[PDB]
């Protein structure tokens, strides 16, 4: 049962180090060799380095060099990476991997590091009104646009999860305000639209949001 | 320094079929590329190791081959499991280095979108912003364009689409294209048009409104 996980997650600002950990349950903490590696968002793997729990020796990757620093720790039996100055172009899942032979064996759950000199704010909740004009063949559309909010998530359940069907909780984007805005689309019989009432819950949970805006057609 | 190249970035495959993914070194890397499977929640898994070895708990599903410089992944044959992520690595020169990895997506029939335009509400408006949302519902394959239209111009470098993954269920994607200016710009205009251009589509179709008539 020798797993070697990561912490769950954490944002900071620009020009701010950071020290994230390893683990070690069952082998030795001199044993293996950790290596940490940069997963960006929609991208292959990217090494960053090897310690060595005992001499302490250190291999970075050349371009990781100047950047972050291999620590370790024999006592408590963990491995430590720090970024010295991150900037918006770090924000990544990072790994670190107890690499058995000269491949790694054993991984450890990402810990996601967001990069952003945000301020954490709630969102607004637009109605996406009823499109069944000549989209009046049988179902028509509508949703919920949650807007500008930092950070995440934001879950988005229809009708307190009563309708989980044809719901669609799109992927936020990140604006060029650092703002995220994301979009709920559920399609809906166009007769039902009267028939049955419709109403979003959205829920950005630090800024501590909680609406339940109800989107019902428009008049015209 | 030793880069490492897969192929294709992105693969179709139809469930219970033998798949070939495609890996080839820079220089000559000896027997030393390693495959790695990783689901979009979790981190990678070793799965071979060496260049041909089903690493510790491997089904006999997966094998390997490859030599100096060309290297293969083969499924023998999909399943619910094996449609994810995989990475081709490498571990025999300084730095190490990983290929841009390459995608397992389940097959199906073309499936033209449903495409609906929703005008900005007045509360978004009243405060400043006016986010105009096209939607492109169930399409497939993922392979989609939105053309953005305010009174005949061709928008630029002011919209923002989102894609879903495959639904769970039917299999098929779906996008919003999102287009936003202030509600002065937007009063500047009447007529917003979404012309959305699929190969599930004989010609392109486009949502349009106008502000005020419906």
């Known amino acids: 049962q020798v797993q070697l996980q990561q912490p769950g997650a954490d944002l900071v600002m620009p020009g701010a180090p950071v020290k994230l950990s390893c683990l070690a349950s069952?082998?030795?903490?001199?044993?293996?060799?950790i290596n940490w590696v940069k997963q960006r968002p929609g991208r292959g793997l990217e090494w960053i380095g090897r310690?060595?729990?005992?001499?302490?020796?250190?291999h970075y990757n050349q371009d990781f060099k100047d950047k972050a620093t291999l620590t370790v720790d024999k006592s408590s039996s963990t491995a430590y990476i720090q970024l010295n100055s991150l900037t918006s172009e770090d924000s990544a899942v990072y790994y670190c991997?107890?690499?058995?032979?000269?491949?790694?064996?054993?991984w450890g759950q990402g810990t996601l590091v967001t990069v952003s000199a945000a301020s954490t704010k709630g969102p607004s909740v637009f109605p996406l009104a009823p499109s069944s004009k000549s989209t009046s063949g049988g179902t028509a559309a509508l949703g919920c646009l949650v807007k500008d909010y930092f950070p995440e998530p934001v879950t988005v359940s229809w009708n307190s999860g009563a309708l989980t069907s044809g719901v669609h909780t799109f992927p936020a984007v990140l604006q060029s305000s650092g703002l995220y805005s994301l979009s709920s689309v559920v399609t809906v019989p166009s007769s039902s639209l009267g028939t049955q009432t419709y109403i979003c819950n959205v829920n950005h949970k630090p800024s501590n949001t909680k609406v339940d805006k109800k989107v019902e057609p428009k008049s015209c | 320094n030793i880069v490492m190249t897969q192929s294709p970035k992105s693969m179709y495959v139809s469930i219970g079929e033998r798949v070939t993914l495609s890996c080839k070194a820079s220089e000559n890397v000896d027997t030393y590329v390693s495959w790695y499977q990783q689901k979009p929640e979790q981190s990678p898994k070793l799965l071979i190791y060496?260049?041909?070895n089903r690493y510790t708990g491997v089904p006999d599903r997966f094998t390997g081959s490859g030599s100096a410089t060309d290297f293969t992944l083969t499924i023998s044959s999909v399943q619910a499991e094996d449609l994810a992520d995989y990475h081709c690595?490498?571990?025999?020169?300084?730095?190490?280095?990983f290929g841009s990895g390459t995608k397992l997506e389940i097959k199906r029939t073309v499936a033209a979108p449903s495409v609906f335009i929703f005008p900005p509400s007045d509360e978004q408006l009243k405060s400043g912003t006016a986010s105009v949302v096209c939607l492109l519902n169930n399409f497939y394959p993922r392979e989609a364009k939105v053309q953005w239209k305010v009174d005949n111009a061709l928008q630029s470098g002011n919209s923002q689409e989102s894609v879903t993954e495959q639904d769970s269920k039917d299999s098929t994607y779906s996008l919003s294209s999102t287009l936003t200016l202030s509600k002065a710009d937007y009063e500047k205009h009447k007529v917003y048009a979404c012309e959305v251009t699929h190969q599930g589509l004989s010609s392109p179709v486009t949502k349009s409104f106008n502000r005020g008539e419906c």
């Open positions: 310690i060595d729990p005992s001499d302490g020796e250190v």
């Open positions: 991997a107890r690499g058995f032979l000269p491949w790694f064996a054993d």
């Open positions: 690595g490498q571990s025999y020169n300084y730095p190490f280095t």
């Open positions: 060496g260049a041909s």
């Open positions: 069952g082998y030795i903490f001199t044993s293996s060799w």
